[PDB]
Symmetry: C4
Subunit: 116 residues, 4 copies
Amino acid sequence: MIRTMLQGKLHRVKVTHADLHYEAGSCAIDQDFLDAAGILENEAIDIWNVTNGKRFSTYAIAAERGSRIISVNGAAAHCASVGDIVIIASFVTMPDEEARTWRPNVAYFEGDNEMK
Amino acid sequence: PRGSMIRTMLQGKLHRVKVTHADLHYEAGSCAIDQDFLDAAGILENEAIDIWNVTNGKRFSTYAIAAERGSRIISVNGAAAHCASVGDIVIIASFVTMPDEEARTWRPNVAYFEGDNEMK
Amino acid sequence: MIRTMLQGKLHRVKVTHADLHYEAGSCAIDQDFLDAAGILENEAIDIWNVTNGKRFSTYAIAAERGSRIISVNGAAAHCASVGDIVIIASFVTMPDEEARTWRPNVAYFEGDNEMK
Amino acid sequence: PRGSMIRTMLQGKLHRVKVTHADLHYEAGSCAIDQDFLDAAGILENEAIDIWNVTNGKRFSTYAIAAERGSRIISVNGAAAHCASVGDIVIIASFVTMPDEEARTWRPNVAYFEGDNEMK
């Protein structure tokens, strides 16, 4: 039996403006943050808005390392405003035997998206 | 049989358990659940779960974390506290995938609750 | 690469009252309808409400053959009223090579949930 | 490597295509899409798809069916017509699963659109 497990998460990051124009429907995320959380470019992600309770799913794309960028682009902009605090999570599947000991990758933040 | 069609099946659920705690302030995302309850429903730490709030009709998905055995805690944390409040009655389910022949004889792990989150 | 494909659907059935009391969070469906659509007891299903546009997911349980029952129980009752027309669908995964020729199971209805 | 962790990845998408038809009256559920567009995005008939409506912010999931090659049709059928209207700009995506090493080098199939659903 195959389980769906938390692969990784960005724990309480803030939505920023986008430094560059990104395609609608995606969330652009500083590559440093993707590296820490194990989240891949083009991976399905869930975004849970702690500020307003909204929950939606999209996919990740890399923003430049150091940009600290969390940009919800396009249709997704209907669900998150600049300054909102969100959780970004990806999930993976694996057999039950492996899932029993699985440890997700978590990145924690302080200040203006400064990674602890 | 390689290439067999794979089903998504109810693995287990906590049926009509009561929310005991709900905090916007950070154990953010998760629902923390008494480990005895997780055991009964076959739900794992860090497993994706669906929560159906029977009280207010909201439906959301998150992941499970273990609370202390015997605490009888159901704590909806972070963003999820916008979807459930202390006192609300919820159903917490996990789903697994398996081939069709297995799915046709699968029995979910169900825990039923009454009163002070007493497992029946 | 593994594709997610429509396994089967009940095409435009009506939500009924429940003949018996069913557990909250589920949808009870006449076993004849499950048989035609290939939908299993305890299988995840999507319900799309044609009447009011609401969309949600739950799991299937068998109602008695011949009962014609489509009962959305409990929390799910917030999303479908008796007389609403819905589509009920299940999805399966399989490799791309098989998915290219995959055919879903579809049941069509007339009158008061009378299966064509 | 048996037991490898499996990722959910964007397989392909139709980026900013325009809805041409929307009917509550029964081709119910699906979104019918010009087969040329399906080919470009690697999307299959009967494949699950996510639709993000850029015009109204609605997000829903359904499955794809093929419309006639060269018709340039995007028809949102049945319940889905409550989520999109003729003229609305949408993104239609499919997701697949694959092991992690494959996912790390995966390139999605993307089709971009302008004007009269002209594929760029």
